[PDB]
């Protein structure tokens, strides 16, 4: 009864970071070894928990959050970070105790002439709370004049394309990210290691 981590890590298409996807994992055996033994990953940071000790703990739910950002933004997927991604797109809590996993996806997510299909939120009235998701396309009021849903001076569309060309510097190449969160509730702990 294997946890379906394959569906997340090996998905053909990933979400834009503003529209990040969550998979709820429950009622299954989690083989964390397949992840922590892999040569596929450039980032594999776990905060106060080791994939090794996960193999003898049970959780009520595990969440796998997945999306694309550029290489130099992977550092923002960590507790206590700021920047466009942490502030407006995907926010970890200060007390995060899960894992952040990332790999270069230049082969899949870039194309000659530019892949523009991956977006991020460039403007927002306030910072996201941890694990908050905002997919609104409200015209953003940068000035004192209301926009009334009409773009113009100081009235902007809040989303912006990444420009992923395969010749980009590695800092500007696409990275696929999976964030694992481990949840223990009053209810039965049914996600266990082997």
């Amino acid at each position, epitope marked *: 009864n294997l946890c379906p981590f394959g569906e997340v890590f090996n998905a053909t298409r990933f979400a834009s970071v503003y529209a990040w996807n969550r998979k709820r994992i429950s009622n299954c055996v989690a083989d964390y070894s397949v992840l922590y033994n892999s040569a596929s990953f450039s980032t594999f940071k776990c905060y106060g928990v080791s994939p090794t000790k996960l193999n003898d703990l049970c959780f009520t739910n595990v969440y796998a959050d997945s999306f694309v950002i550029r290489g130099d933004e992977v550092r923002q997927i960590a507790p206590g970070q700021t920047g466009k991604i942490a502030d407006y797109n995907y926010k970890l809590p200060d007390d995060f105790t899960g894992c952040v996993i990332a790999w270069n996806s230049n082969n899949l997510d870039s194309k000659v002439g530019g892949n*523009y299909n991956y977006l991020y939120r460039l403007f927002r009235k306030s910072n996201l709370k941890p694990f908050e998701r905002d997919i609104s396309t409200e015209i953003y009021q940068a000035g004192s004049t209301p926009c009334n849903g009409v773009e113009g001076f100081n009235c902007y569309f809040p*989303l912006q*394309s990444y420009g992923f060309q395969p010749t980009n510097g590695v800092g500007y190449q696409p990275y696929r990210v999976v964030v694992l969160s481990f949840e223990l509730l009053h209810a039965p702990a049914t996600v266990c290691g082997p």
Partner: nanobody
Amino acid sequence: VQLVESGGGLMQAGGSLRLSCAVSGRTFSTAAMGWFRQAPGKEREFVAAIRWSGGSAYYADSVKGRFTISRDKAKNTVYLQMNSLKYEDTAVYYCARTEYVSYLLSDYATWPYDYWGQGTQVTVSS
């Protein structure tokens, strides 16, 4: 992916024509559509753009108050309503499509678009 234009043709000055541009084939996303025109022996020039999301429009100074760009998302079609036609409006009109999302609508006036239609003749007579 194909952009299929229709409408336009011959109309006397002061009259109104509507151009259509239908997008066919599998698309992942559409950021914006635009109309451009090329008069014989002149460079192709921007006419109008519309953001697919929200429908905000951006116009060349030469067509403000005369032309309206609009789009039907369900029909994947963009339209140019060409009112108060002048001899200067005589040109081949091209629709264009991009998946590039800029926060800044005015960027669609100068952005190099990814996909182009075959072009549709508009001729304004006396």
